[PDB]
Ligand binder design. Sequence first.
Ligand SMILES: CCCCCCCCCCCCCCC(=O)OC[C@H](COP(=O)(O)OCCN)OC(=O)CCCCCCCCCCCCCC
Ligand SMILES: CCCCCCCCCCCCCCCC(=O)OC[C@H](COP(=O)(O)OCCN)OC(=O)CCCCCCCCCCCCC
Ligand code: F3S
Lengths: 144, 37, 397, 449
Amino acid sequence: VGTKYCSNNCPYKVRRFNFLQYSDTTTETFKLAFNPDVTVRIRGVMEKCTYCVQRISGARIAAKRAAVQAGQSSYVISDGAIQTACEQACPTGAIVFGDINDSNSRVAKWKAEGHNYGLLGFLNTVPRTTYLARVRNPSEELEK
Amino acid sequence: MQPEWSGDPEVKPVFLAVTLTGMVAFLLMVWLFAFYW
Amino acid sequence: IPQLGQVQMLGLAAAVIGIGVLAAGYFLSPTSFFESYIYGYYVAMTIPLGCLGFLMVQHLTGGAWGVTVRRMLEAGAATLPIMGLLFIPIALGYFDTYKALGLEHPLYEWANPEVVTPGGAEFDPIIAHKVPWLSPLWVTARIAIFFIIWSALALTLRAWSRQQDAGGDAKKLATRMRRLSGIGVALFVITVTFFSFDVAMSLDPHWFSTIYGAHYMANAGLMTLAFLALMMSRVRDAALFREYVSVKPIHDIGKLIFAFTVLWTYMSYGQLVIIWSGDVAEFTPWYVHRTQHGWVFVALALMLFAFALPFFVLLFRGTKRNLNTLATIAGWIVVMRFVDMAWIILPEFREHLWDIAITDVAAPIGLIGLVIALFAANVQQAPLLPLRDPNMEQLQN
Amino acid sequence: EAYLLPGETYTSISAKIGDVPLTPPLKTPKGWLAGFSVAFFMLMIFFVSVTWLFIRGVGIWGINIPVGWGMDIINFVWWIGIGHAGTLISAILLLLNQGWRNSINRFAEAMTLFAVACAGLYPILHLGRPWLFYWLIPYPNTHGMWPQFRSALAWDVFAISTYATVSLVFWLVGLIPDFATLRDRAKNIWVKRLYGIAALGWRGSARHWHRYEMASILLAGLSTPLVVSVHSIISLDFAISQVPGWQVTVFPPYFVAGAVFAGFAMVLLLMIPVRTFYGFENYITLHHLDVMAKVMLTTGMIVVYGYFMEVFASLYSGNEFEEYLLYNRLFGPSSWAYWGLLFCNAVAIQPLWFKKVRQNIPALLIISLIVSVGMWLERYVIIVISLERDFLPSSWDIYIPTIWDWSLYIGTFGLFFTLLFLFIRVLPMINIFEMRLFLYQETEKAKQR
Ligand SMILES: CCCCCCCCCCCCCCC(=O)OC[C@H](COP(=O)(O)OCCN)OC(=O)CCCCCCCCCCCCCC
Ligand SMILES: CCCCCCCCCCCCCCCC(=O)OC[C@H](COP(=O)(O)OCCN)OC(=O)CCCCCCCCCCCCC
Ligand code: F3S
């Protein structure tokens, strides 16, 4: 409805509000560029990244369809099944996404590292996006 | 103290009409809002 | 007069039981004696500070209830320097008198050397940050200053109303008590909020609350109102309560008991829903320590027997106009305020519901008995119910 | 002194209060005409601001992504908080048996209702999809969804709706016997039916007055905890939030005190002209304004105590975020509002301790005006400054209001003053009954001495 309270309380301020009609409602070429698996937002609603949930939902439906086609009744989803777009396009591979309950996944092996940390731990949010601390390798001549 | 309509012959069927109003109107909202889709 | 002597004797016997079991608790383990004395002094200080503040509130807001219990409020306010003399064992407790009297650590974590000293073994930086504010000299200076203002306020108001029995009173001396109570109400509010800070909220220096003190305000006022209604029932046959007091001030005081019960549960729910809904981990350990290890059932019994039954019973006219059942309600209120201050203070050093020693009952009953004995000695030294007063006619309606 | 001046009979109460309504509409005073014309102009400014709010969206306001609640929520808290002191005279003084409420409670209830109508538009107006405001209300839908009910705006919707309805109910029962008098003196035949169905044929009587005092005392007993809770919940939409300047445990009693403080300022600013221009000097004495300044002084000290509690929370805590809160309030880019807050709501209230300052009418009016402005500044310091600088310094940005925030504020002033001017035209502004009862109680005190 657009209360924007949800902006004020998220301690990382990652939510974004459609204050005006930002979405291109008129230019047909810009209407062709919109991906139809995501809603194009109207004025007055919130926005934040959804763990790129069109890809999660599509891989979920794919896993469940292939599970019921085999008949396993399991629905096991692969670790490489979901690559979010801002993971798929990072050239350095810093962003790593996947299932964390499954210990075999890359993201759960990354989160088991000792320099993994969540942003603003004192607010008891328990983030699912965590950070590896920047471990530098300086030399003996400019720091020591 | 008692109300001034306590000893009136209208106090039986009017207060029966408030509950017959309730079980008509509220049950109509029940039918429309729960059983009408 | 004679029932006052009866309740004074009962308070003296309670104080004797308290000092006997408190000295036994020093004989077993003196740290338990000292923490129980912290609790006993806090729940003993609920009486005279609320008495002082309610005397000044009724001098600001001249009512028939206020004239009805002005002299009992003045007696309760008169006990304050004896409350300083009962404070100073605590001041020995957190000072350099430590390493004597068997204490393993001092009574407060800021009174600890190692938790606040720079370069020490502990160096806990939350407690070491507040070391100018929370140091033994600063806290003793602050508490003694608050004692000075409270004793000056109380003894000046009591001496002026003692001068009111002669003359210069229908416009003089009541404007003086009005101005003094008007400045002092703000003084009393800030000083007893800071007192509640230094005594209770600094026991765990990792946590703070800004509604603390106001929580202690409502606790002190509601203990005071129930105490006032409790011994108003004893002095019914004083012949002067029968000459000038009717059941309309009784209804007023029961009304104020009801209002302070709902104001206190509003304060406690405000703190609870603020800390609970905004789940930030510097405010949350207070309620983690207070719903764990058996303290949760004390919290629910506090919600069910100090709010819901006292609210629901006090909606009616009888149990407010009648005085006997109002006294039974007030006794239940006083006991429930004891249980609440147990929930407020004892999780900071007990950690279990089943760890509550016999000293945690010895110190509240004993120090309340000392409070009641000094109170009932102070009522008897003056005529109760000031007969010559410009606010007298509200008793006659 | 005395709350009622002598020389007054029941005929004189009904003549002086009753004839300010039921005047011929073409015989209406020209000062009223000028004030209502100004209020009509500012209500058109309201309608223009609301029109451009609906068409373009909420982005015409100066809100950005850190400050999601800018000047709109500030005016909401200010306008809702004005109603506390009006309900205080309406209900709390009725409970405490206070003799000064007898001439004020009509005006107090009226401006409570009008400040509620001015405030209650802001939860609808600040949405940016305001046509879905009913989604916050639990209503039967085909979706099967519900409001979250643990949000404090979900508490706000119930809170403002219940508060609006109870204050309207208290106004209507407080108005029924004055409707009965105004029906009995109207002298135009059609207006007698209009005030007649308004009075419902009240028939001022024992076994009707018993239920009158009984229901009015009891409704005061219902509305007295209610306005405290409704302004506690207006506090709680910051106090449950995890922002450092908003998660403060003192906030519900401190917002309650700030509400009574700002509302008493507004009752001052809008009843000194009602006392002077309309000749109600006997009904609203100087002791009335003395005791009202005293109650405003009480709430101002509790508010200054709340500022001290904020300073103590920021200094006592070892957290970086509370300390940077106090720094950015004291020396930040928006620190002007905090300095004007300690000049306004703290320095200027210490004059009210002295009786001659309280009895001086121009000083009392101007100090009440500083109370209202600095109260608004307190809401600014609580909301906007704490939303400016947050946990992550990348999410730090300044808040600057646009012309449309001020346009909506002035327009809500117009809606308030317009509704107030229709109130002081068609209806009486002092309780005619309960002043006759106050006249009875005053002469009975003069009898029994
Ligand atoms: C929103 C503001 C906060 C509300 C807090 C609740 C207030 C109390 C509600 C009940 C009102 C008083 C109960 C009955 C009573 O005792 O009043 C009687 C008396 C006047 O009646 P007489 O018969 O004597 O007639 C005299 C005139 N003819 O009322 C008073 O004198 C006023 C008492 C002062 C009220 C003190 C309670 C306020 C609590 C402090 C709140 C501040 C917050 C603290 C941080
Ligand atoms: C243990 C004590 C309890 C804690 C108390 C601390 C808080 C103190 C608040 C109580 C003070 C009440 C207001 C006093 C100031 C005042 O002037 O009011 C009294 C007036 C004067 O009466 P008159 O007619 O002039 O004297 C008659 C002479 N025969 O009258 C009133 O009673 C009005 C009372 C107003 C009560 C509401 C305002 C106080 C609370 C609001 C703040 C709430 C914050 C959460
Ligand atoms: S608080 Fe909720 S109402 Fe919308 S702007 Fe946020 S999702």
